[PDB]
Amino acid sequence: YSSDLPTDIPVLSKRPHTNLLDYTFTTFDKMKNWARKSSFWPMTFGLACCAVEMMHVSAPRYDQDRLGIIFRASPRQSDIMIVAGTVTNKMAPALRQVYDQMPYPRWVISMGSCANGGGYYHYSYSVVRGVDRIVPVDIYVPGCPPTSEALMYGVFQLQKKMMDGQTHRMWYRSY
Amino acid sequence: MNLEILDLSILGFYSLISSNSFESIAILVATIMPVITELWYNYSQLFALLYTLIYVGAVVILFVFILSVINEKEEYEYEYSGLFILILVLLLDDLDDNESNDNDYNNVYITDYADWFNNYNESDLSVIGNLLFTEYALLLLIISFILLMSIIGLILIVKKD
Amino acid sequence: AAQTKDNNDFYDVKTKKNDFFPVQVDGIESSLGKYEEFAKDAHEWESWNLQNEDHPEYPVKRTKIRHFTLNFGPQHPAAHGVLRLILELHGEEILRSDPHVGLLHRGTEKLIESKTYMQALPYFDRLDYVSMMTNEQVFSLAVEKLLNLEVPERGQYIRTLFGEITRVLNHLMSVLSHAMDVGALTPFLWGFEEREKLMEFYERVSGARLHSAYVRPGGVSQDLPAGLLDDIYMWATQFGDRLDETEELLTDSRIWKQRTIGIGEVTAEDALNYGLSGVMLRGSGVPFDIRKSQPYDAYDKVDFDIAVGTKGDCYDRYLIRMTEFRQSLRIIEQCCNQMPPGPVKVEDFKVAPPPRALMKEDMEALIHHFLLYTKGYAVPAGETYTAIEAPKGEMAVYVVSDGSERPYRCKIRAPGFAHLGAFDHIARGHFLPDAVAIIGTMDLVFGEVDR
Amino acid sequence: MLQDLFNNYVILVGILGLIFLGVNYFIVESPRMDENNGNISDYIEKSGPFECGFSSFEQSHNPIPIAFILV
Amino acid sequence: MLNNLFDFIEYIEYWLIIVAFVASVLIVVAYLTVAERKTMGYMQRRLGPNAVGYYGVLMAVADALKLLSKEIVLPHNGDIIYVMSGPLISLFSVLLSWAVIPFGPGLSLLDSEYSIIYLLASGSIGVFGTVIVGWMSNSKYTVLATVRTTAQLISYELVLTTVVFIIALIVSSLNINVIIESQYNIWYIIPFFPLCLIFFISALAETARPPFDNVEAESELVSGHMTELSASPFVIFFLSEYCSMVLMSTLTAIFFFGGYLPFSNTIHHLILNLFDQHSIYYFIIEGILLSGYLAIKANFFMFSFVWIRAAAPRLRYDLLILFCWYVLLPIVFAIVVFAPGILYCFDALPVII
Amino acid sequence: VSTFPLKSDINITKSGKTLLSVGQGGRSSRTGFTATVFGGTGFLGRVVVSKLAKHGTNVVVPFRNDRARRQLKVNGDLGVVNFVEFDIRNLKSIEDSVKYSDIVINLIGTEHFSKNFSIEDVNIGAAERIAKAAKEAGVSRLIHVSSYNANPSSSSDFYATKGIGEQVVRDNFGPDATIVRPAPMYFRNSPFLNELLQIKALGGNVIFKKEVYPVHALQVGEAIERIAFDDATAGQTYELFGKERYSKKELREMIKHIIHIGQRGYYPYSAGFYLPAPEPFLYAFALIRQYISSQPRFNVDQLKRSHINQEIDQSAKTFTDLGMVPDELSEYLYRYVKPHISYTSQTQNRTVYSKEDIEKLRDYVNTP
Ligand SMILES: CCCCCCCCCCCCCCCCCC(=O)OC[C@H](COP(=O)(O)OCCN)OC(=O)CCCCCCCCCCCCCCCCC
Numbered sequence A: 001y002s003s004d005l006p007t008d009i010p011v012l013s014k015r016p017h018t019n020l021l022d023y024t025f026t027t028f029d030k031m032k033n034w035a036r037k038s039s040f041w042p043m044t045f046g047l048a049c050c051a052v053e054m055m056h057v058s059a060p061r062y063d064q065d066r067l068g069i070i071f072r073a074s075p076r077q078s079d080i081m082i083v084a085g086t087v088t089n090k091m092a093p094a095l096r097q098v099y100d101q102m103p104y105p106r107w108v109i110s111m112g113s114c115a116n117g118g119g120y121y122h123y124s125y126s127v128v129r130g131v132d133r134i135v136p137v138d139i140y141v142p143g144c145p146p147t148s149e150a151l152m153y154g155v156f157q158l159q160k161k162m163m164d165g166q167t168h169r170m171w172y173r174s175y
Numbered sequence B: 001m002n003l004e005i006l007d008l009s010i011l012g013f014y015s016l017i018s019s020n021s022f023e024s025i026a027i028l029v030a031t032i033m034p035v036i037t038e039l040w041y042n043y044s045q046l047f048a049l050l051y052t053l054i055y056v057g058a059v060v061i062l063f064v065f066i067l068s069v070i071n072e073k074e075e076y077e078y079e080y081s082g083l084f085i086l087i088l089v090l091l092l093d094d095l096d097d098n099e100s101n102d103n104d105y106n107n108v109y110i111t112d113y114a115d116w117f118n119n120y121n122e123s124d125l126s127v128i129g130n131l132l133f134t135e136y137a138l139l140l141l142i143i144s145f146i147l148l149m150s151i152i153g154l155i156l157i158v159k160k161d
Numbered sequence C: 001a002a003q004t005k006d007n008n009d010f011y012d013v014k015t016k017k018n019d020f021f022p023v024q025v026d027g028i029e030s031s032l033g034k035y036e037e038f039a040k041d042a043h044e045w046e047s048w049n050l051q052n053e054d055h056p057e058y059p060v061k062r063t064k065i066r067h068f069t070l071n072f073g074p075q076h077p078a079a080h081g082v083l084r085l086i087l088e089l090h091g092e093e094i095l096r097s098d099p100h101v102g103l104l105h106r107g108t109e110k111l112i113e114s115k116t117y118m119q120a121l122p123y124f125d126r127l128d129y130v131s132m133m134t135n136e137q138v139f140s141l142a143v144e145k146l147l148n149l150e151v152p153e154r155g156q157y158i159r160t161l162f163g164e165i166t167r168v169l170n171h172l173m174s175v176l177s178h179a180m181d182v183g184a185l186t187p188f189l190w191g192f193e194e195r196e197k198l199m200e201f202y203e204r205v206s207g208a209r210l211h212s213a214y215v216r217p218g219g220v221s222q223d224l225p226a227g228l229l230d231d232i233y234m235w236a237t238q239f240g241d242r243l244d245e246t247e248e249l250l251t252d253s254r255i256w257k258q259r260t261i262g263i264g265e266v267t268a269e270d271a272l273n274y275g276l277s278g279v280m281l282r283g284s285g286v287p288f289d290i291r292k293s294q295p296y297d298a299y300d301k302v303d304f305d306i307a308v309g310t311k312g313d314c315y316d317r318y319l320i321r322m323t324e325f326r327q328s329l330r331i332i333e334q335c336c337n338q339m340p341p342g343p344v345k346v347e348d349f350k351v352a353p354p355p356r357a358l359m360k361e362d363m364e365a366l367i368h369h370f371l372l373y374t375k376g377y378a379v380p381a382g383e384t385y386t387a388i389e390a391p392k393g394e395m396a397v398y399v400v401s402d403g404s405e406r407p408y409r410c411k412i413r414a415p416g417f418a419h420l421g422a423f424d425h426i427a428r429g430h431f432l433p434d435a436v437a438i439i440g441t442m443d444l445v446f447g448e449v450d451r
Numbered sequence D: 001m002l003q004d005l006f007n008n009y010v011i012l013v014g015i016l017g018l019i020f021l022g023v024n025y026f027i028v029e030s031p032r033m034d035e036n037n038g039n040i041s042d043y044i045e046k047s048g049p050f051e052c053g054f055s056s057f058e059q060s061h062n063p064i065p066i067a068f069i070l071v
Numbered sequence E: 001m002l003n004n005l006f007d008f009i010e011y012i013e014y015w016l017i018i019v020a021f022v023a024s025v026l027i028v029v030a031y032l033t034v035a036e037r038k039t040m041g042y043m044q045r046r047l048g049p050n051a052v053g054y055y056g057v058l059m060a061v062a063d064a065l066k067l068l069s070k071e072i073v074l075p076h077n078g079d080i081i082y083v084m085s086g087p088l089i090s091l092f093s094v095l096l097s098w099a100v101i102p103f104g105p106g107l108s109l110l111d112s113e114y115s116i117i118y119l120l121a122s123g124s125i126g127v128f129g130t131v132i133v134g135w136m137s138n139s140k141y142t143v144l145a146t147v148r149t150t151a152q153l154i155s156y157e158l159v160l161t162t163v164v165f166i167i168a169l170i171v172s173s174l175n176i177n178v179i180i181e182s183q184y185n186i187w188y189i190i191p192f193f194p195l196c197l198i199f200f201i202s203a204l205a206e207t208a209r210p211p212f213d214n215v216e217a218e219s220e221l222v223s224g225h226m227t228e229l230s231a232s233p234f235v236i237f238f239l240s241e242y243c244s245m246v247l248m249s250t251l252t253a254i255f256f257f258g259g260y261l262p263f264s265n266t267i268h269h270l271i272l273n274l275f276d277q278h279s280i281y282y283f284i285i286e287g288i289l290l291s292g293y294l295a296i297k298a299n300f301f302m303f304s305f306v307w308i309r310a311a312a313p314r315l316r317y318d319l320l321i322l323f324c325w326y327v328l329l330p331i332v333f334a335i336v337v338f339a340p341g342i343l344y345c346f347d348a349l350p351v352i353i
Numbered sequence F: 001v002s003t004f005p006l007k008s009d010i011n012i013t014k015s016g017k018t019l020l021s022v023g024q025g026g027r028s029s030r031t032g033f034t035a036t037v038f039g040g041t042g043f044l045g046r047v048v049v050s051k052l053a054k055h056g057t058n059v060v061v062p063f064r065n066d067r068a069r070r071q072l073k074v075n076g077d078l079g080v081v082n083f084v085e086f087d088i089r090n091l092k093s094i095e096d097s098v099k100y101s102d103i104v105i106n107l108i109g110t111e112h113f114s115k116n117f118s119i120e121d122v123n124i125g126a127a128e129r130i131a132k133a134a135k136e137a138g139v140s141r142l143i144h145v146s147s148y149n150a151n152p153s154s155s156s157d158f159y160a161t162k163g164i165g166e167q168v169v170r171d172n173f174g175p176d177a178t179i180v181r182p183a184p185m186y187f188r189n190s191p192f193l194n195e196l197l198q199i200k201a202l203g204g205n206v207i208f209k210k211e212v213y214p215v216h217a218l219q220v221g222e223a224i225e226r227i228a229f230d231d232a233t234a235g236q237t238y239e240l241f242g243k244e245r246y247s248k249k250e251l252r253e254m255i256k257h258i259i260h261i262g263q264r265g266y267y268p269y270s271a272g273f274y275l276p277a278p279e280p281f282l283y284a285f286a287l288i289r290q291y292i293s294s295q296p297r298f299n300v301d302q303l304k305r306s307h308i309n310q311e312i313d314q315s316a317k318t319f320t321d322l323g324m325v326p327d328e329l330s331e332y333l334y335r336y337v338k339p340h341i342s343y344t345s346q347t348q349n350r351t352v353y354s355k356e357d358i359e360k361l362r363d364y365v366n367t368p
């Protein structure tokens, strides 16, 4: 039982493509990453005034549908959870249950000061000081409310992160 | 390889193990489908489509009645059965599948000789309509009379007022 | 009420009143003997049963099973935000509705008591978070009345001009989302571009698209930038066509009228008794408007009309909100023409902050600037109940002052809170899709409800 | 009238429907490649019914009155 | 090779024809989803999808591929029967209905004198697929959709079936291709304009499209029977619903607008006179023209399916039940008597030739 | 967990640093400790990270799966949980994970070998590299988790490599290395219980005959919390196991009655709840799937381990040395098999199995 681990093999995010199978699984990842980035389906989870700016992203001026963005009423059909509003202690168990009902892959966006850290109601007896206390957050959008362009910029950042996923090349090189 | 045998064996297996009412209406669908497909080939394509047109509409009305009556009874009632005895029962029923005991009628094949005397060729449905509306018009009118009775009958049974 | 031997929480034994003579039957016998001779074995014989199930007094223990309990919960598009609407359904007909609120309760009134009057103002922007500037106006009026101060003429017109711009913004959100819930998706998109044009007016004068802390006790935060009135007027010449095109799809549509006519009817007697106000009150035939009953902020110097319904249903309230659209546009035109010169805030530096240029040159201006932002301004002790004709209805604030710089108590009266309290009385007997229309016709924002 | 072409189409349609399910079963990454929350048969918080956030009474097998039964 | 390849292709030729036929239907269905979003966008003064593929031409691919790479939610892996039995039955019902749609004279996979019956019978099976999802389900929103789905079927099924029978009665034939050829001199839109409106209304009800979108009302039943569906089961149901939209749009072009018949007979002759009938290029162009005539008429009603969605609010299902039985059924039954009276009066009872 | 994990607010590490804890022991509190949890995205890792971060201890989580690390950050406040993208074949990445750490917990281990790593590389090579890197970084405490049947002379690859892993870690890091030998752990989504809950368990007659001493996973994570913050546990070996011995066949049948698979007599046999297969066939199927299936299946080594029962090293220490009473599987069995119940759904009455109910059910299973 002799083990000889190499010492200077770069991590996956730095590892270049050497053989033919690297390009094969990178092609597999990019086809999936493009599909999920293009078919960006958030869930209709408007809580407070942050939701109004979320509606104006669907407004004709910005037209989120032009990017492939469709809001779904069911957690089963949505892969993006946008927490747009204040999360109260009375609401926190409902938010966790809805998040758990989303099939993978799933991402969570925290929009506004309420969802980020509580904002104006940080020192309230009935307000959760950040939705990250309940669910993992992938991107935080600042503002009170964040503008329609501020939210779109955050979505673009998430789509940039999604396009860098290497799920199937990770199996080939890291597992 | 007659695959109709395998489909009926699967259908018969679930008939003995069906517990709730939803599985029973599923048995009905799993019965009409082999009938329609075996009618679509071989004997009569016309009545294979007629069976689909009429019975599928009856299935939906049957299904919507089940939603108003299910009362949790078969969701917790236990059944015992046993895998070995169920297979034994189906195996013995599989042994005898000769509906008739005229061996000559079942084993000797026959042919028909076509003729050109029928220059006016039309579908069987047109001939059925020709006789039903002329020769047996009384049957058609009585059937409408029965349909009228059903319409009145349904209202008086169901309507509260 | 109370557990009885014939009625408890788990089962009941109902016996209807008898509709036939109490016939006396004695000496039951057969051809072989008396009933008592065979009664021991008669339990196996159904023909020997002495009780008829058709009898009204036949004993039957029936388990008490709850109706179809559907949670119109927070994750539902029909609910305009967070609402756990619990419905007792018999099929789809509504028997009893239990609106559960507090999912957006953030203790705003508790937090206000720890803030100065200037610090407490931004909390009102987030109660009715589509009609932001009207929320600031009712709190500003309450503090001004307590302060015994009067806004100058130009300040009043600005709060009137943006008061109706706010009302147009609210009705755009209210009516189109109500139509979107019913099924009309296209009018929602048409009017939300008009919101973008009007929210640009919000951002031009304050720097915030939605939460513009512009209306403050003693006037407005800042004066209008140059060219705003021209841009407002240019929008005004075109907004008339947008309203007409909206009515092209709803007003005379037979599908829309079948979803609103006769739905959610409210009598004039019951509307007052449930504290309904605004379109809910005016839909039942009562011509009451706060802008006419108690004029405030230059509303007594503009000409406008109020639409009053007759049948008290959703369709009447839709028609009223469309008339209020045109009357608000009528007021906005007058404010543009009649905007006077002068200060936009009270000429009192002990309440209103001094100009920045004067702050950096005058000793007294610096002191007043320093103290207004560090300690705030004290308000004479007392209490007030100031109400304004909010787009949702009657919004009022009950502010208690103790002579300090922080309000002692700030009770916020929400028309949506009162409207939703009558949902059970209004939506009973209607079907499930009618509830969605009733929710939309009340113009419910749950930040206002759960303030 | 010959229907051999029709029979081939019906065979393809049946096979085509299984391809959509088979592709989806063989394309999705394994749970260990994802957050590794285990199999769906154990993730009861996900496989449970959807009630808009708040769990309610379980009335799967309760009677459902129908107002259009006569129709 | 060569000789063994030039007969292998002949051996597998008709499978390529079916595969091409399947691809032809799928392409229209795939881009109907893109067309609907683009059409509603401009009517709503937005743009619609234009950032997924060059000008949005890959929007359909991204939506399908992303959902095919999604987790399937079910109580257990062995429960693949429950959430797949419904959508598969619905998908098979609409795909088999396309077998009797002739893109040209005799260019249908299934030719029979009972094609009309097969069309209606196959479509009725798709209703059973929708009700399967509500199989003693624990989801209250799934259950409510099944009740509404049955109610809608009672509304349109009688009305839709009788309207098709009137067209068949006028031609005295239940063959779809015979119905198309019978419209050479007159398109049935002119004599039966009320029936075309009635057929389109029934088509909207059958597909659960707005203003009859009570099964999948987002503001009433979040997602209806699909609220518990994800990944492949959602795709198959989504594919089947849009396949019905194309099929019903194509049926409207067949029954009332002459099917594949040219808009102008003179223009059809001129274009084909440019090609030699002794070469295969004539029949390649001929198939393009005849199906192009069908495509233009079918695309108009697929446009109309989107058009009514962007212009009318949703109607309650109980109002729909009264609408069909009190209004549509008396009208269609009146016409089924009116039409034979006219034909017999002028000695014009139809025969098959 | 409790409300304050440390026995004192001032702790002096083996390297001489003085660490002061602040707060009462909540999310906003701190303990002054920074810990690195190798393999923190695994089954036991999430429990360990949750316990450490919930009291304010800074946790550094090396990871290779980007999606699996996201749920770990919820455990701690802002700045408490830190992530480093790492690979056991990248020496620099490992050295960055332990640079600021006072405690290093090595939870990296595997029962299978893949196209990139063998059993030796993960169980021995990875442990040695982590242990040696920790010492050069001056880490006060190192905690290594071996297996329950760790024996360098064992005929099983998993047990032998775990046994060698214990020795190679003590040589590199030094005598101050604490080694933990946990029994099979039961918990939500536990690998020990997932195999028993699988309806189609191929070769249950050959695999489910192993006898073990299952231990609660929450207690194993709790024990690691005790060991990390108690310097008196340095240099010792801990065998974590339950009091009651169980065979997988008894657990399999006990679970079958809890899930109510037997409500239909025919169903368990028809559904494939029993799949008797010869061991030579299972060896062939395990050998084939070692090079065809892309997901870790029942491999050859696990087939060998089915014939080896869990033997407890008496010389090693137990929960008693850490001042804990092992949890009984009968108490926690129902709550961890509850998600897999067929229908339940409060139809008539939930059958809640208590501590006494499970023990009685064990007698029924063994009753012929
Ligand atoms: C058509 C393709 C898509 C559908 C494929 C689904 C395949 C499932 C079996 C189809 C029916 C075959 C004949 C069985 C008769 C119906 C029996 C039944 O209830 O469905 C079987 C299904 C199996 O689950 P299981 O747990 O073993 O049964 C319950 C045990 N208490 O138990 C269930 O209750 C699940 C029912 C799910 C919904 C099925 C509705 C009926 C489907 C009929 C369409 C096919 C027509 C029949 C074709 C075969 C004919 C033998």
Ligand SMILES: NC(=O)C1=CN([C@@H]2O[C@H](COP(=O)(O)OP(=O)(O)OC[C@H]3O[C@@H](n4cnc5c(N)ncnc54)[C@H](OP(=O)(O)O)[C@@H]3O)[C@@H](O)[C@H]2O)C=CC1
Pocket: F038, F039, F040, F041, F042, F043, F044, F045, F063, F064, F065, F068, F087, F088, F107, F108, F109, F110, F111, F117, F122, F145, F146, F147, F148, F182, F183, F184, F185, F191, F192
């Ligand atoms: N019933 C049980 O589970 C028992 C546990 N053990 C041992 O306890 C320890 C904890 O494992 P457990 O949580 O229970 O279950 P797991 O086997 O799923 O945990 C394995 C952990 O080690 C990581 N790992 C494995 N190989 C590598 C590798 N080449 N590179 C980097 N990381 C790797 C994994 O990271 P990643 O997830 O990102 O792949 C994972 O975090 C293991 O060493 C196990 O052998 C022993 C007896 C009983």
Ligand SMILES: CCCCCCCCCCCC(=O)OC[C@H](COP(=O)(O)OCC[N+](C)(C)C)OC(=O)CCCCCCCCCCC
Pocket: A030, A031, A034, A163, A164, E061, E065
């Ligand atoms: C068969 C199943 C159905 C069809 C599915 C098709 C899905 C669409 C494809 C996804 C698109 C995508 O992902 O392209 C997006 C990516 C960009 O990736 P990025 O992350 O933005 O930058 C990272 C890439 N760099 C580092 C190079 C910038 O473009 C490419 O690199 C395209 C270049 C690859 C070669 C293209 C030509 C080769 C021929 C390809 C056609 C045969």
Ligand code: SF4
Pocket: A048, A049, A050, A051, A084, A085, A086, A111, A112, A113, A114, A115, A119, A120, A143, A144, A145, A146, C126, C211
């Ligand atoms: S962050 Fe601001 S805009 Fe967003 S919900 Fe909270 S108060 Fe409203």
